[PDB]
Tab-separated table of N, CA and C in Angstrom:
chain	number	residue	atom	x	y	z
Q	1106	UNK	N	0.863	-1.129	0.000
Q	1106	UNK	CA	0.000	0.000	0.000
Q	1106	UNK	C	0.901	1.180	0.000
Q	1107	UNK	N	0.279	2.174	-0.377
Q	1107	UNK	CA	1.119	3.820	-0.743
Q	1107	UNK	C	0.233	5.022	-0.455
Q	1108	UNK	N	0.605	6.132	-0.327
Q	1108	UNK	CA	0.237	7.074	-0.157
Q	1108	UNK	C	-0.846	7.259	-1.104
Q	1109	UNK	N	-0.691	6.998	-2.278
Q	1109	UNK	CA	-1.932	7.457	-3.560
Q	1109	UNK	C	-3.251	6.450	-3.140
Q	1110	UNK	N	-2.684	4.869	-2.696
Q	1110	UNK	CA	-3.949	4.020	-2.532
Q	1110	UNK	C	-4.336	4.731	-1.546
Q	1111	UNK	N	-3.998	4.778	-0.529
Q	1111	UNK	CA	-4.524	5.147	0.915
Q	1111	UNK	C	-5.269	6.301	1.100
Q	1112	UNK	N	-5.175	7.574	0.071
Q	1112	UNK	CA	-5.873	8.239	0.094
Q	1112	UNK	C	-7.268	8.282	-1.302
Q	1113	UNK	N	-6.599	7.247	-1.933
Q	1113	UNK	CA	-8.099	6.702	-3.196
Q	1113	UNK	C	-8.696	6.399	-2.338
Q	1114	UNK	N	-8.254	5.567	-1.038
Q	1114	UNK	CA	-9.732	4.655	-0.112
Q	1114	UNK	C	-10.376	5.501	0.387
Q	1115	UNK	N	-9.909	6.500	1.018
Q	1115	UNK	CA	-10.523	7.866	2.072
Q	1115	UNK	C	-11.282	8.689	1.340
Q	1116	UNK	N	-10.762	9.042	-0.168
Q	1116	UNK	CA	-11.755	10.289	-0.809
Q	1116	UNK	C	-12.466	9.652	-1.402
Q	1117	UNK	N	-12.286	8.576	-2.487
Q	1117	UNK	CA	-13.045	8.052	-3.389
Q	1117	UNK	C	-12.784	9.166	-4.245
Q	1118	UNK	N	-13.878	8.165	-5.728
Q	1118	UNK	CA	-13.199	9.193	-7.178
Q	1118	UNK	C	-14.463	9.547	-7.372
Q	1119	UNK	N	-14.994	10.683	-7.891
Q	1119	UNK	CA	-16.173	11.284	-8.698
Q	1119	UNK	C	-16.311	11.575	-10.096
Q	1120	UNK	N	-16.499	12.069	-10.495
Q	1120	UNK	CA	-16.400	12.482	-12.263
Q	1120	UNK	C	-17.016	13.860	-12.534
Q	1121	UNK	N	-18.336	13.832	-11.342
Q	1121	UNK	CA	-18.660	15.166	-11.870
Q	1121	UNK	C	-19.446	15.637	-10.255
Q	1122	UNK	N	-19.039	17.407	-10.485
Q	1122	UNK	CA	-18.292	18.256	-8.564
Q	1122	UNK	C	-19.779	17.643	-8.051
Q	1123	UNK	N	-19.296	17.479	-6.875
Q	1123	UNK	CA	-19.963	17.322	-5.695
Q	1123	UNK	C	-19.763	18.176	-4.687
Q	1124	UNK	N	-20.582	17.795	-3.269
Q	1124	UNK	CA	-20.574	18.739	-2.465
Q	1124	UNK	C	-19.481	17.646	-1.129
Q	1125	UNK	N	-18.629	18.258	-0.613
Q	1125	UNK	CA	-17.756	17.643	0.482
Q	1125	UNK	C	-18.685	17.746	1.345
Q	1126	UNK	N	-17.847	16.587	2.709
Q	1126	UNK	CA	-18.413	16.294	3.791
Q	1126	UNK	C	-19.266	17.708	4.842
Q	1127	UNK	N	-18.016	18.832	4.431
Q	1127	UNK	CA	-18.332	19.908	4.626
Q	1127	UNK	C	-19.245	20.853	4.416
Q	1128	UNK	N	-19.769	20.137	2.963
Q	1128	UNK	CA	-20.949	21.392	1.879
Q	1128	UNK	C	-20.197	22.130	0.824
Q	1129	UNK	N	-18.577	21.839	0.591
Q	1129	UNK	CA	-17.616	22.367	-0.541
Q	1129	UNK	C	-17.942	21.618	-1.876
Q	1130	UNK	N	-17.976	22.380	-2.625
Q	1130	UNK	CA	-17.195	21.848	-4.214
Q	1130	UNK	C	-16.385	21.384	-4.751
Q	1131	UNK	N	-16.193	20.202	-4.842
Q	1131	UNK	CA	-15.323	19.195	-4.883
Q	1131	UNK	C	-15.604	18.305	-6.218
Q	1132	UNK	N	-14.249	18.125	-6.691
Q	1132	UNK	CA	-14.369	16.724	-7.830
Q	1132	UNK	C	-13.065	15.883	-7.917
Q	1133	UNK	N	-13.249	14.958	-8.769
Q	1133	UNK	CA	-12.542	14.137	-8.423
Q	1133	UNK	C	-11.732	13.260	-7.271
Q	1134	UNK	N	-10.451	13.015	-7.178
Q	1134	UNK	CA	-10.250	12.319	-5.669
Q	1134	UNK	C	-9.824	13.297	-4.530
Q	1135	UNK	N	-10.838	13.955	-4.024
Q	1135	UNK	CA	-11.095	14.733	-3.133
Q	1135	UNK	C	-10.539	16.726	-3.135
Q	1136	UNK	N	-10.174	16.932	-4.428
Q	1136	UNK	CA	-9.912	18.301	-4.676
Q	1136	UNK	C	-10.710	18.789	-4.864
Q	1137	UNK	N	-10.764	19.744	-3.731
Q	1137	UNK	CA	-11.508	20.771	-3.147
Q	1137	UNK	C	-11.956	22.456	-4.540
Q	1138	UNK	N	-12.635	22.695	-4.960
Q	1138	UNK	CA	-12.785	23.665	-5.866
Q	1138	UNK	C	-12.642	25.015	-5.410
Q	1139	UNK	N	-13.793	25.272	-4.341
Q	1139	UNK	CA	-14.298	26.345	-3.774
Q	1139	UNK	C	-14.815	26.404	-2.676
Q	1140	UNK	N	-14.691	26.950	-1.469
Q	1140	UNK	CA	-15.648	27.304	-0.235
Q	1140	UNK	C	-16.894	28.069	-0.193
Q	1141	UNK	N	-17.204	28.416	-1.997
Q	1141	UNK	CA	-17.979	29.464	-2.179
Q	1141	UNK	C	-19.456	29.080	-2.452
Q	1142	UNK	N	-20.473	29.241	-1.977
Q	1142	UNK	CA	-21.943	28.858	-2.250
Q	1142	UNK	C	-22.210	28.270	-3.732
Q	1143	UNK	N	-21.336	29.291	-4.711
Q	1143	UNK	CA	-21.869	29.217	-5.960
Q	1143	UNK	C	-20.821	28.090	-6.689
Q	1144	UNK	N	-22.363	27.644	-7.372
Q	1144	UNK	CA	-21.697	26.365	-8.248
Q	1144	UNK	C	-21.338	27.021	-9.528
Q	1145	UNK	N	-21.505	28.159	-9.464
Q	1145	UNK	CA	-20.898	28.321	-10.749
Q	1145	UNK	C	-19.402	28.989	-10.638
Q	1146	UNK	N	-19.016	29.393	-9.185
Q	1146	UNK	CA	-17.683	29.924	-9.097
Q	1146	UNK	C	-17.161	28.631	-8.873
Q	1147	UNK	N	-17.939	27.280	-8.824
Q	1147	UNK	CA	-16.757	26.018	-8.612
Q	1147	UNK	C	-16.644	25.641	-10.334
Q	1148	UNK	N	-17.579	25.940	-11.160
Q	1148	UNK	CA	-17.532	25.453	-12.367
Q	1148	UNK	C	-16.347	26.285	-13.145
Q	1149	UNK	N	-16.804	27.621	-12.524
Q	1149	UNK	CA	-15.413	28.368	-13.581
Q	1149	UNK	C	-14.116	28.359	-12.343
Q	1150	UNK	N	-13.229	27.973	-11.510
Q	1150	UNK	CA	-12.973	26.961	-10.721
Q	1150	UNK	C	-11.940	25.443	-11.401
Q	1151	UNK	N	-13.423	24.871	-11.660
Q	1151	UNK	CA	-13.119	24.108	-12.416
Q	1151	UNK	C	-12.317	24.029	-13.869
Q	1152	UNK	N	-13.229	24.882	-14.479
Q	1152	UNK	CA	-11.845	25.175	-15.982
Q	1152	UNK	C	-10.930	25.646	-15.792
Q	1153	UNK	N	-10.579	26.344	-14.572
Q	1153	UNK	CA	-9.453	27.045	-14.951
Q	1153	UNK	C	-7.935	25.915	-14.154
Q	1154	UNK	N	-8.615	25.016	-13.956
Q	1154	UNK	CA	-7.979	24.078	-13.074
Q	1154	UNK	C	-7.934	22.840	-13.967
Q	1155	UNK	N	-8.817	22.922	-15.232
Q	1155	UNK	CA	-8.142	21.854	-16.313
Q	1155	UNK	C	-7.825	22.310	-17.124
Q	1156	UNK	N	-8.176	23.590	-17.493
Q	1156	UNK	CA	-7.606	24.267	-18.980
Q	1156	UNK	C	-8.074	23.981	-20.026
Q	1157	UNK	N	-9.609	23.357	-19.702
Q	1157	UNK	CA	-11.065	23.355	-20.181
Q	1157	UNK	C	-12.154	23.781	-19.845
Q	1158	UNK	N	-13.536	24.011	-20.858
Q	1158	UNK	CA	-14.708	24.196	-20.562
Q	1158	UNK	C	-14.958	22.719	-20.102
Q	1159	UNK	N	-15.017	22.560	-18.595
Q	1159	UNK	CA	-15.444	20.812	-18.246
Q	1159	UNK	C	-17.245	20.887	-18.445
Q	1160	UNK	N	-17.736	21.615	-17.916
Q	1160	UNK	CA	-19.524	21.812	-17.731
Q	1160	UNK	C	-19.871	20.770	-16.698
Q	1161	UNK	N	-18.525	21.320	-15.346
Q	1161	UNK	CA	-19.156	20.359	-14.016
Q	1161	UNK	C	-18.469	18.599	-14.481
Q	1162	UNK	N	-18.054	18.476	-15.505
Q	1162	UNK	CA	-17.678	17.181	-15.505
Q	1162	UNK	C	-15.960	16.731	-16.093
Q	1163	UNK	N	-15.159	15.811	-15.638
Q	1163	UNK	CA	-13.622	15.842	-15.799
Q	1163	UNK	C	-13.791	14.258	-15.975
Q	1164	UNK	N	-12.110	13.606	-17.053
Q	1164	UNK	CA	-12.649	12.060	-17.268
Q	1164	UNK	C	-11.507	11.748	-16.088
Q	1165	UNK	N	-11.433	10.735	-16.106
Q	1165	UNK	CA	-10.796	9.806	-15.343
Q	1165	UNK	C	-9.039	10.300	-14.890
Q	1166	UNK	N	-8.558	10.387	-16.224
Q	1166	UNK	CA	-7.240	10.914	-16.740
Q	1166	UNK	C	-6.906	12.491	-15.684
Q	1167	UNK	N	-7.805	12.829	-15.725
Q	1167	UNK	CA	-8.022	14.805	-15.180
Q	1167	UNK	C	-8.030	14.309	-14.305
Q	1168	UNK	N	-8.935	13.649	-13.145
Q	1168	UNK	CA	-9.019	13.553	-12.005
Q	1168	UNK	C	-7.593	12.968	-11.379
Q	1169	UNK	N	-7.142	12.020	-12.309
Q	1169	UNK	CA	-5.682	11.828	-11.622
Q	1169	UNK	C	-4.796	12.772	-12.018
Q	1170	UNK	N	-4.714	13.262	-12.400
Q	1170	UNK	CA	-3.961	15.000	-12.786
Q	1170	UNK	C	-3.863	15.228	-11.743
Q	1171	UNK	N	-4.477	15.961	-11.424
Q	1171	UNK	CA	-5.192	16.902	-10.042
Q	1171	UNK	C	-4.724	16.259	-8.867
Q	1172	UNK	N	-5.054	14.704	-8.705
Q	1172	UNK	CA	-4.156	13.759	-7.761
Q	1172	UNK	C	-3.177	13.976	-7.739
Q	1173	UNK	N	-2.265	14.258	-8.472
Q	1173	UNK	CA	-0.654	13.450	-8.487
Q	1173	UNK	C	-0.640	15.364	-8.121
Q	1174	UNK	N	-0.992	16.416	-8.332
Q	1174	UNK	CA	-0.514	17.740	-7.728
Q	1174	UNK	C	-0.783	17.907	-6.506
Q	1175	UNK	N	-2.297	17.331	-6.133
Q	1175	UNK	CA	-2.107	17.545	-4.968
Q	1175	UNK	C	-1.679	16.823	-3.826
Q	1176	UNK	N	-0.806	15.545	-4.162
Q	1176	UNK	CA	-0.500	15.445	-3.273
Q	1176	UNK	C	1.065	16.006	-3.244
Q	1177	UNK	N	1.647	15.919	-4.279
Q	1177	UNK	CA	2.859	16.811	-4.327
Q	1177	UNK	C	3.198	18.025	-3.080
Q	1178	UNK	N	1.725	18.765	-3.968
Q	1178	UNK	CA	1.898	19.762	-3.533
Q	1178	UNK	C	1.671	20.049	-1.771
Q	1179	UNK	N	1.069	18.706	-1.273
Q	1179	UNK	CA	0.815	18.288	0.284
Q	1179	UNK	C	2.382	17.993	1.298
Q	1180	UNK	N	3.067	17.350	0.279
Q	1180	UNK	CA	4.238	17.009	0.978
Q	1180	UNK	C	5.465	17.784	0.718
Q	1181	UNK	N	5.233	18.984	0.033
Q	1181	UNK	CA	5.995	20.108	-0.290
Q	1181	UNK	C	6.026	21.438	0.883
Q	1182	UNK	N	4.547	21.027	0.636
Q	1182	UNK	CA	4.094	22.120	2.338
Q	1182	UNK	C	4.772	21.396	3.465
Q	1183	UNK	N	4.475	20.090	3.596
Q	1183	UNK	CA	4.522	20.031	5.129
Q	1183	UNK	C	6.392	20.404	5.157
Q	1184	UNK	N	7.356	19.838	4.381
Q	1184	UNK	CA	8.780	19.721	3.637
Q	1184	UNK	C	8.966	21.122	4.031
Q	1185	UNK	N	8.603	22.536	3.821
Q	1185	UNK	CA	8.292	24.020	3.937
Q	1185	UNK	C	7.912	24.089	4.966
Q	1186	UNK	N	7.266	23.260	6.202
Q	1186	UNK	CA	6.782	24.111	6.964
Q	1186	UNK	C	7.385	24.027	8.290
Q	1187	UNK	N	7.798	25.028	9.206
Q	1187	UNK	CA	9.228	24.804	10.477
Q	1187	UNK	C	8.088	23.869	11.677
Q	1188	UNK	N	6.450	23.465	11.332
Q	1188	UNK	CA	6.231	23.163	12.596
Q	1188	UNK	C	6.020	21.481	12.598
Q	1189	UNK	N	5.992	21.355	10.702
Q	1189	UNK	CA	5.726	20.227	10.282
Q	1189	UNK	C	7.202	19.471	9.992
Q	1190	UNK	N	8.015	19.697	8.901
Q	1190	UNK	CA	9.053	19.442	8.624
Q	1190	UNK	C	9.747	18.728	9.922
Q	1191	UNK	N	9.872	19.153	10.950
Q	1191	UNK	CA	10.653	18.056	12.155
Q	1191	UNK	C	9.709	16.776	12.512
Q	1192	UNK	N	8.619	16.733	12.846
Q	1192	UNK	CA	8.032	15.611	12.783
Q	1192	UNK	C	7.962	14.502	11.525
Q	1193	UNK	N	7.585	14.920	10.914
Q	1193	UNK	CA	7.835	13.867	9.413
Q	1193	UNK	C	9.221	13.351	9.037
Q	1194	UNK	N	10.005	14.539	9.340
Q	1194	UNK	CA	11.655	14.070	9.388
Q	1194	UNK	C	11.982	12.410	10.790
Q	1195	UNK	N	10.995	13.084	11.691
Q	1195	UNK	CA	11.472	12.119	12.750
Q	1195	UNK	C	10.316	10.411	12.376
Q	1196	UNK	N	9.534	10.880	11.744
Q	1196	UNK	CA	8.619	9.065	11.173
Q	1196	UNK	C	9.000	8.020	10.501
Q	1197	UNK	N	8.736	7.058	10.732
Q	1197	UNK	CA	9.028	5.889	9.945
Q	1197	UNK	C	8.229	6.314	8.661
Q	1198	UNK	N	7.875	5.388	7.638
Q	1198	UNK	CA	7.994	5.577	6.603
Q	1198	UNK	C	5.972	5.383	6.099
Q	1199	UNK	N	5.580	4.874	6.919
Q	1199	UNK	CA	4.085	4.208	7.429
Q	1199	UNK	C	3.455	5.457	7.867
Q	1200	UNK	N	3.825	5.882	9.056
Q	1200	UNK	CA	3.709	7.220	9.350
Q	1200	UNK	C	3.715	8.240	9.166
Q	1201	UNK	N	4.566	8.615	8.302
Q	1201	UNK	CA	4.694	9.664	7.178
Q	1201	UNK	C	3.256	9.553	6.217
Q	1202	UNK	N	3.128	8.351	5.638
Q	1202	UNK	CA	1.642	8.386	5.247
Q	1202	UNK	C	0.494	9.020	5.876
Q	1203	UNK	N	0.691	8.643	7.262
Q	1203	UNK	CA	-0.730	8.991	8.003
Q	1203	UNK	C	-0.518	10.812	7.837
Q	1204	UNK	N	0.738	11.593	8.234
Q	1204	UNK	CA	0.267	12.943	8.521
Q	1204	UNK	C	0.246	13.657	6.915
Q	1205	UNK	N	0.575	12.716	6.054
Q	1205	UNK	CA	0.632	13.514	4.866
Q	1205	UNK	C	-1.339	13.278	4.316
Q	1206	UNK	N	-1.679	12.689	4.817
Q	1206	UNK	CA	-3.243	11.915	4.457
Q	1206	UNK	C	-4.303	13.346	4.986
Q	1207	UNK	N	-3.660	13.776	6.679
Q	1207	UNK	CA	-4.171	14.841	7.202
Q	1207	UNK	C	-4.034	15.912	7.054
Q	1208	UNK	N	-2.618	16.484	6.584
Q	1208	UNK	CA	-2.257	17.893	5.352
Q	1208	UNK	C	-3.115	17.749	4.303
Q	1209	UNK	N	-3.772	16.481	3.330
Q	1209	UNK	CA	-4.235	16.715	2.469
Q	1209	UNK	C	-5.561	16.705	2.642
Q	1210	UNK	N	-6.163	16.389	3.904
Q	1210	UNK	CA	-7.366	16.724	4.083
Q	1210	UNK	C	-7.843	18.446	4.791
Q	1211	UNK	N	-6.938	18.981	5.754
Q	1211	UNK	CA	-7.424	19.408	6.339
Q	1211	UNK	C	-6.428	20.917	6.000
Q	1212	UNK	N	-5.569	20.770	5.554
Q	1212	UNK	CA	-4.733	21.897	4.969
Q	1212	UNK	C	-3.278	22.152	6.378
Q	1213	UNK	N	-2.183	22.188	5.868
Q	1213	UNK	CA	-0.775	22.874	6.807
Q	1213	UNK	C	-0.991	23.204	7.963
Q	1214	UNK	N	-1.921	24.717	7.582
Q	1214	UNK	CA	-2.048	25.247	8.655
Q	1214	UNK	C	-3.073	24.568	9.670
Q	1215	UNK	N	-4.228	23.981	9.537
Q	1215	UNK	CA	-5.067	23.175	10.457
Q	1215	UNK	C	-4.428	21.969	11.330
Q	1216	UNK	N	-3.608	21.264	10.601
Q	1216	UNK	CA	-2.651	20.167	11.030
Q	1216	UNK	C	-2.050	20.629	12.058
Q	1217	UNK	N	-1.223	21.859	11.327
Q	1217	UNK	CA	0.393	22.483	11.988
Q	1217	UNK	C	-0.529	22.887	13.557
Q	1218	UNK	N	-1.882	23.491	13.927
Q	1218	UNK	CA	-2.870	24.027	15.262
Q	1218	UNK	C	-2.828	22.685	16.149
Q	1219	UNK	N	-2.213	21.218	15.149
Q	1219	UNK	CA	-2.178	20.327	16.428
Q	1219	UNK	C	-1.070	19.890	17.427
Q	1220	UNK	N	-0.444	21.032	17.865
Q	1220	UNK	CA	0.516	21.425	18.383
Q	1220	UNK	C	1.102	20.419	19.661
Q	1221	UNK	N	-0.293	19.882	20.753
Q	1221	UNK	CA	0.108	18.799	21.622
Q	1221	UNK	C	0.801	17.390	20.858
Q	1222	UNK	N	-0.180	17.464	19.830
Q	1222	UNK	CA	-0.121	15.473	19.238
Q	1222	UNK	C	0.769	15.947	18.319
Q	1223	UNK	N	1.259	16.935	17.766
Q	1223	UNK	CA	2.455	16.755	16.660
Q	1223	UNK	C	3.735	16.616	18.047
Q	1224	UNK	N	3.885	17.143	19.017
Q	1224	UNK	CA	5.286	16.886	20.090
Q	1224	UNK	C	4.969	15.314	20.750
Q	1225	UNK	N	3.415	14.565	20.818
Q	1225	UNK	CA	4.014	13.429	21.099
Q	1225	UNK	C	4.186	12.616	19.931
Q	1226	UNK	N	3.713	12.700	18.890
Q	1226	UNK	CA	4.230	11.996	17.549
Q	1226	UNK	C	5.864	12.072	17.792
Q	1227	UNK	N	6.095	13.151	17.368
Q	1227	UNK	CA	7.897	13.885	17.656
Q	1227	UNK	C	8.316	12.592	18.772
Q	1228	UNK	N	8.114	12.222	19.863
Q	1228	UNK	CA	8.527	11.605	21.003
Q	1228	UNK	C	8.570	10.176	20.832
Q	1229	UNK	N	7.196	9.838	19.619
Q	1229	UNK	CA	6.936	8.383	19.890
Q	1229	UNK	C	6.414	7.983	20.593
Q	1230	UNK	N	5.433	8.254	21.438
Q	1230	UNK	CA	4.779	8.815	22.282
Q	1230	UNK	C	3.093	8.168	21.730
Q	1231	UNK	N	3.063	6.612	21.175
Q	1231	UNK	CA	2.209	6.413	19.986
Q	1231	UNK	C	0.709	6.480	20.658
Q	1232	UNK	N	0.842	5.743	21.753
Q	1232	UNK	CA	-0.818	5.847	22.524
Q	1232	UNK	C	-1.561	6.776	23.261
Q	1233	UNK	N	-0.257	7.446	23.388
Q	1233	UNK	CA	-0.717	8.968	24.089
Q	1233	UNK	C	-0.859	10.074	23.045
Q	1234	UNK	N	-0.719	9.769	21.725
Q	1234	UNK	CA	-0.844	10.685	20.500
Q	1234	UNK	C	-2.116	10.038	20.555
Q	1235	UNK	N	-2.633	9.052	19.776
Q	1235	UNK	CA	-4.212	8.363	19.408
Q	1235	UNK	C	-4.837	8.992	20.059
Q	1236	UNK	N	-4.861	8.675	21.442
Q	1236	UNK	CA	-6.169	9.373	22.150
Q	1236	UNK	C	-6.489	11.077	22.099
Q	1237	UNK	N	-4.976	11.853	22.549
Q	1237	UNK	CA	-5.491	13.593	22.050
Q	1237	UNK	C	-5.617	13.649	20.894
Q	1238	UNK	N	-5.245	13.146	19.446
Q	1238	UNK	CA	-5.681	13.493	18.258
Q	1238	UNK	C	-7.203	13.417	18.259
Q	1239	UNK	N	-7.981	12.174	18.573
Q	1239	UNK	CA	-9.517	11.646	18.829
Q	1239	UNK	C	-10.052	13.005	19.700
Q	1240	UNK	N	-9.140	13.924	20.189
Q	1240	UNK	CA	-10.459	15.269	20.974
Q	1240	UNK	C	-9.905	16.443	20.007
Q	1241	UNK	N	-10.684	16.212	18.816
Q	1241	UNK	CA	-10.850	17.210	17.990
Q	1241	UNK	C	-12.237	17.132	17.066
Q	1242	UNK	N	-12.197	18.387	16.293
Q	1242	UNK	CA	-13.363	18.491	15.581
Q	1242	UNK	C	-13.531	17.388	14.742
Q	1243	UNK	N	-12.411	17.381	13.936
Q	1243	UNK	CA	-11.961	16.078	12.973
Q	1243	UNK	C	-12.502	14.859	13.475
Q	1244	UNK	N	-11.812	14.100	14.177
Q	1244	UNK	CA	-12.140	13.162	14.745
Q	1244	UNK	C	-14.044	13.271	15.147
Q	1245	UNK	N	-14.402	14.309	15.312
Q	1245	UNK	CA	-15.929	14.000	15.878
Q	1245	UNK	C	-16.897	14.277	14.493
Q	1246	UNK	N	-16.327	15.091	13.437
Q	1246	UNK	CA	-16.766	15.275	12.158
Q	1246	UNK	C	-16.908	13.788	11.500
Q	1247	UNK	N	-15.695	13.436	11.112
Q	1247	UNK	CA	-15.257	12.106	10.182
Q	1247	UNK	C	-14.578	10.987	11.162
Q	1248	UNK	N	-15.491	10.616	12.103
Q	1248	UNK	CA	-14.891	9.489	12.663
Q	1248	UNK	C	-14.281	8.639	12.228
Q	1249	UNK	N	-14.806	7.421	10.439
Q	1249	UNK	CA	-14.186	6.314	10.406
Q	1249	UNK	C	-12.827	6.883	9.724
Q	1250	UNK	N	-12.939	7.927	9.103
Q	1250	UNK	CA	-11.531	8.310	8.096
Q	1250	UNK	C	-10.850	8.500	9.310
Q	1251	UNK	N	-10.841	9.674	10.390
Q	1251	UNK	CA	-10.389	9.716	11.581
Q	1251	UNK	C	-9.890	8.504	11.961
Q	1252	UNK	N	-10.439	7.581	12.806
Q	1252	UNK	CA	-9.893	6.170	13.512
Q	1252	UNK	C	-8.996	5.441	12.214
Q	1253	UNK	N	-9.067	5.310	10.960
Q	1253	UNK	CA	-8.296	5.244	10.432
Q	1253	UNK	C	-6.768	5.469	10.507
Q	1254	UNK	N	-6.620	6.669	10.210
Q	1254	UNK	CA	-5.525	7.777	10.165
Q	1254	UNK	C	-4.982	7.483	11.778
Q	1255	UNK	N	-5.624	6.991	12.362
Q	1255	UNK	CA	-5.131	7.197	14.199
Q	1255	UNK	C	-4.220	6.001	14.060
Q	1256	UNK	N	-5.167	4.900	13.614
Q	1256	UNK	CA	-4.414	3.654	13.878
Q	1256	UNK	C	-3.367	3.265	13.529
Q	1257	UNK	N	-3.124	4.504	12.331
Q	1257	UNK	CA	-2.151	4.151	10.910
Q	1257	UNK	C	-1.160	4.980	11.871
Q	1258	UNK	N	-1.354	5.734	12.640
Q	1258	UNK	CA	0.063	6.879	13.691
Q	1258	UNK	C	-0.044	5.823	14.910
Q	1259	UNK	N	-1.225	4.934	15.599
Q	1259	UNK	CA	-0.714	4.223	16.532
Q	1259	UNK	C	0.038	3.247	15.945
Q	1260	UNK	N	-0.434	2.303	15.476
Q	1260	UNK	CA	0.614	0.670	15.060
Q	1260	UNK	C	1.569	1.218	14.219
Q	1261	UNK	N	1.562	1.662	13.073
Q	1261	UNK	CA	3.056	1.911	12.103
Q	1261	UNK	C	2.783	0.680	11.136
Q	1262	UNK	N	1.698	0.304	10.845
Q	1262	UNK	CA	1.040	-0.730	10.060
Q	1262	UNK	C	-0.543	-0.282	9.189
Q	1263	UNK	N	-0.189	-0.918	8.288
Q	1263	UNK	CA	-1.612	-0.545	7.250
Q	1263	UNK	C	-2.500	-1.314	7.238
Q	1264	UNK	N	-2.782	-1.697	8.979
Q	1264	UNK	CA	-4.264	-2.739	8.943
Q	1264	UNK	C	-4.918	-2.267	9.140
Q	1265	UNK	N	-5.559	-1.008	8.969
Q	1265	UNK	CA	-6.826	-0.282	9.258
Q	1265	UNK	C	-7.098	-0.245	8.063
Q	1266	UNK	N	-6.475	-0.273	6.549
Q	1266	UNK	CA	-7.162	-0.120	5.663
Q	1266	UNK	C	-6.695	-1.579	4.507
Q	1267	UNK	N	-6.125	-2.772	6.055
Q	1267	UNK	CA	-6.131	-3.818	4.416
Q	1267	UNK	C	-7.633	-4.982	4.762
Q	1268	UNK	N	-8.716	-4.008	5.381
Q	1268	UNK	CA	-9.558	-4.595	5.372
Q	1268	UNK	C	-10.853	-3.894	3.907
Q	1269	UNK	N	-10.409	-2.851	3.726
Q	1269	UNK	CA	-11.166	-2.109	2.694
Q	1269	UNK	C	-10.711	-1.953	1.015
């Protein structure tokens, strides 16, 4: 398993925008369009993010486009960022999956606000990270993706998702 499967299982693929867990504009494997009410600022949004008139709809090919940038562009941030960069430096290689899964859900800066559980990650510190990560919004929003992502920072193993 890899970073690209692990987050195909969590977003799933679409073809044409939907609304996120949130109420966002979203297509394909989980790229986010717009925070904006209007479907038509996600549609024009949308073209300007394939460098087509899509009309709300992208094929298969586009949607993994968009994949392979954003996650790039996920592990570039955290790589850039002074609060992220030491923790990921200090993970095994399993682990590194899990916080790059939560940069790409929740954005740098939302991650980087988890300031207790990124110093016991840092420590190794694995069961006493699980439980304060679980008292957040996240965790009470998206529980199963949540307990997921926990288990994948408690064990350092990908059996939370080689059942799916």
């Amino acid at each position: 398993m890899n970073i690209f499967e692990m987050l195909r299982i969590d977003e799933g693929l679409r073809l044409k925008i939907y609304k996120d867990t949130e109420g966002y504009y979203t297509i394909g494997i989980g790229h986010l369009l717009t925070k904006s009410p209007s479907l038509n600022a996600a549609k024009s949004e949308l073209d300007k993010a394939i460098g087509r008139n899509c009309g709300g709809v992208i094929t298969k090919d586009e949607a993994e486009k968009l994949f392979n940038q954003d996650v790039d562009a996920a592990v570039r941030g955290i790589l850039r960022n002074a609060k992220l960069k030491p923790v990921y430096d200090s993970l095994d290689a399993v682990r590194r999956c899990a916080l790059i899964n939560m940069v790409f859900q929740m954005g740098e800066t939302g991650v980087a606000g988890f300031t207790n559980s990124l110093r016991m990650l840092q420590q190794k510190r694995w069961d006493e990270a699980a439980v304060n990560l679980a008292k957040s919004r996240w965790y009470n929003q998206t529980p199963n993706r949540a307990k997921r992502v926990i288990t994948t920072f408690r064990t350092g193993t990908w059996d939370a998702y080689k059942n799916l």
